[PDB]
Design an enzyme around this catalytic site. Sequence first.
Site, mmCIF file in Angstrom:
data_model
loop_
_atom_site.group_PDB
_atom_site.id
_atom_site.type_symbol
_atom_site.label_atom_id
_atom_site.label_comp_id
_atom_site.label_asym_id
_atom_site.label_seq_id
_atom_site.Cartn_x
_atom_site.Cartn_y
_atom_site.Cartn_z
ATOM 1 N N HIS A 142 3.774 9.601 2.486
ATOM 2 C CA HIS A 142 3.939 8.161 2.297
ATOM 3 C C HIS A 142 5.404 7.763 2.127
ATOM 4 C CE1 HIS A 142 4.634 8.113 -2.117
ATOM 5 N NE2 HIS A 142 3.608 8.933 -2.257
ATOM 6 N N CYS A 190 6.927 11.098 -7.131
ATOM 7 C CA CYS A 190 6.229 11.752 -5.992
ATOM 8 C C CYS A 190 7.037 12.925 -5.458
ATOM 9 C CB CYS A 190 5.989 10.815 -4.830
ATOM 10 S SG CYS A 190 4.325 10.107 -4.799
ATOM 11 N N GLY A 198 8.987 7.062 -8.541
ATOM 12 C CA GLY A 198 9.958 8.021 -8.053
ATOM 13 C C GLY A 198 9.609 9.477 -8.277
HETATM 14 C C1 LIG Z 1 4.755 1.879 -11.478
HETATM 15 O O1 LIG Z 1 3.435 1.802 -11.924
HETATM 16 C C2 LIG Z 1 2.448 2.117 -10.985
HETATM 17 C C3 LIG Z 1 2.724 2.068 -9.484
HETATM 18 C C4 LIG Z 1 1.768 2.369 -8.639
HETATM 19 C C5 LIG Z 1 0.389 2.761 -9.160
HETATM 20 C C6 LIG Z 1 -0.741 3.116 -8.207
HETATM 21 O O2 LIG Z 1 -0.268 3.219 -6.905
HETATM 22 C C7 LIG Z 1 0.326 4.425 -6.549
HETATM 23 O O3 LIG Z 1 0.528 5.291 -7.323
HETATM 24 N N1 LIG Z 1 0.699 4.578 -5.171
HETATM 25 C C8 LIG Z 1 1.451 5.721 -4.742
HETATM 26 C C9 LIG Z 1 1.800 5.528 -3.271
HETATM 27 C C10 LIG Z 1 0.535 5.491 -2.413
HETATM 28 C C11 LIG Z 1 0.927 5.157 -0.986
HETATM 29 C C12 LIG Z 1 -0.161 6.844 -2.443
HETATM 30 C C13 LIG Z 1 2.710 5.845 -5.591
HETATM 31 O O4 LIG Z 1 3.354 4.897 -5.848
HETATM 32 N N2 LIG Z 1 3.076 7.151 -6.082
HETATM 33 C C14 LIG Z 1 4.252 7.383 -6.887
HETATM 34 C C15 LIG Z 1 5.073 8.436 -6.147
HETATM 35 O O5 LIG Z 1 6.407 8.355 -6.548
HETATM 36 C C16 LIG Z 1 3.831 7.934 -8.249
HETATM 37 C C17 LIG Z 1 3.338 6.807 -9.198
HETATM 38 C C18 LIG Z 1 4.442 5.821 -9.411
HETATM 39 C C19 LIG Z 1 4.169 5.281 -10.838
HETATM 40 N N3 LIG Z 1 3.496 6.441 -11.556
HETATM 41 C C20 LIG Z 1 3.001 7.356 -10.544
HETATM 42 O O6 LIG Z 1 2.435 8.339 -10.789
HETATM 43 C C21 LIG Z 1 0.153 2.806 -10.446
HETATM 44 C C22 LIG Z 1 1.259 2.458 -11.425
#
Ligand SMILES: COc1ccc(COC(=O)N[C@@H](CC(C)C)C(=O)N[C@H](C=O)C[C@@H]2CCNC2=O)cc1
Lengths: 306, 306
Positions: free
Chosen positions: B41, B145, B143
Amino acid sequence: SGFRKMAFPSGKVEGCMVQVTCGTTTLNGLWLDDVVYCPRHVICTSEDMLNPNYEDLLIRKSNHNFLVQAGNVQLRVIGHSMQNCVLKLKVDTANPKTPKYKFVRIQPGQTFSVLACYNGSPSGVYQCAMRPNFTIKGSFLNGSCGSVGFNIDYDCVSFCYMHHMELPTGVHAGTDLEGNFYGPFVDRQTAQAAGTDTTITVNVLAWLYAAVINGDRWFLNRFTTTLNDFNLVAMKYNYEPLTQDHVDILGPLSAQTGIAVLDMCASLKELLQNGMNGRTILGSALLEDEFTPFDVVRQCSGVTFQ
Amino acid sequence: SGFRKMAFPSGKVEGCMVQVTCGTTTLNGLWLDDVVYCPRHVICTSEDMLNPNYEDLLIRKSNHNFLVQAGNVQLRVIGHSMQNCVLKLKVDTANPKTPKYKFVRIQPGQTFSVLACYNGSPSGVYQCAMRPNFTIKGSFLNGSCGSVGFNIDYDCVSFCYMHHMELPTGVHAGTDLEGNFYGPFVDRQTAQAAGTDTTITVNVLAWLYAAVINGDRWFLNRFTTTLNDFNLVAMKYNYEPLTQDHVDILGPLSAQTGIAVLDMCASLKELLQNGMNGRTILGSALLEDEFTPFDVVRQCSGVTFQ
Ligand SMILES: COc1ccc(COC(=O)N[C@@H](CC(C)C)C(=O)N[C@H](C=O)C[C@@H]2CCNC2=O)cc1
Ligand SMILES: COc1ccc(COC(=O)N[C@@H](CC(C)C)C(=O)N[C@H](C=O)C[C@@H]2CCNC2=O)cc1
């Protein structure tokens, strides 16, 4: 989101761990530049350990009595000295992996990461706090001595603990990296005991702030309290006094959550008086006190280190 | 003595973490030999993330659309491909720090160490378990991921998890290093939810053995039970079934402590039915289920890794 017991990454410290052997005693050492630091009781035997005279024992040793192994390489000892309860071994080779580093003596209530090692090789990493009674609740077996505790401030490894012994209650005692014990302990096999411990109040409050930051709000209330009445409750439950310096330190978390420190103190008072009534906070059924305010900020704001 | 949540030392993994940027999306990558692995992604935008077609999105990209930074060095991308939900970037430079390593897909109940990273730089390390519902209870921010989970078997880093997303309950979901999700999840921003979880029984028993090894015996009793009656109690309390494979796995701890697995199961039954009555086990007021039998042996016997 989420909140876990989190250690600093340990690679920079892993590059410094060596094995030190003297006689039939083997333990770990910390190799920084051209010096290896280790617990001085490595120069002891079963007879010495009951009441050793370390100045005598060290006078009777020679550089060749110390075997130092970095990985497989043997390091040659070209000098030796004692500083308090640590032995310093000058070796002919500077550690090319030496990080930027400092030696710091921490205060009770501060946390640090421990890299448990055996025979110079890392076994694992975990978080500890220096308890108010100057012990730590670690995980250490025979051969663990010389393992170090550290923080990573910004770019700099700050070493704050070297492991020396286990007390009868199963808790642990050791020194700063200049060889001074935390607490009243001494490096001989005698009848030393930990004093009674207390709970680190400023840290419990920091962890309640972490819970709020992560969606746990069920313990909040509308009340506030004064520092004095709170400290009265704290004393009754064997909690450390809360100072104005603690309130200031908790400033940033108060500001991020909008909950004044004294309001959170009212919540803590109620939790102490009534318990949790079968609920949990951040997955815990007890009040946790081994996260500092800085630890909470670090984990909830994503600070990194290089 | 002592028993702590203990991660593997993280240095070998720290040497592999890089930053990957595509457009305005930045996350972490794992650089092993001449390939960087990261979540696919990264090639998305806000418009794509609702229901992306990744084959299309990747056809429209070129090697120069991917910025890879190892420390300060920029690595040049000479090829790209997709494997399930991971992007593989061939770069012109083999990582000189590449450890001996394997990719493994783990079973629910297994634990691993997570090196949380931001912008290619390690923030911290902690232990996790793969829950029966194929989520993990991690600590991850925007950030995060691309951060990976791993075990260190003997000399070999076994990578088992790469982080992709956070669910509405605040728990986390991701893939093996070949890009297959654990659980039914998908990498798009939609309305996915964790199923109901259960408690990992074989791990609670392992932790009771750890408690015995460390002097906690107050929960023991003289009774035993049969696997069937135990599993009936387990079902009533939302515990996973205990298999004969689990009993065999718990063999060594049974032998070291002299407590038969089915005797320890009788203890667990009583703890489930009556609670702890205000006491603690290894410092916990709840039954812990994120230590495997191997974790207990590792920490109570002092295995090391090089
Ligand atoms: C900011 O709050 C939040 C921001 C977003 C969410 C739910 O949505 C997603 O986590 N979508 C995926 C991206 C999709 C395309 C798989 C993501 O955004 N992953 C991040 C990779 O970096 C990890 C997330 C980022 C926040 N905490 C995580 O574990 C929940 C809280
Ligand atoms: C084996 O059981 C046990 C063995 C010994 C004890 C108490 O005695 C000491 O811990 N003495 C010092 C050595 C003296 C000279 C400071 C020691 O022996 N430290 C070790 C350095 O390697 C660390 C100890 C070893 C066991 N667990 C520890 O933390 C308790 C349990």
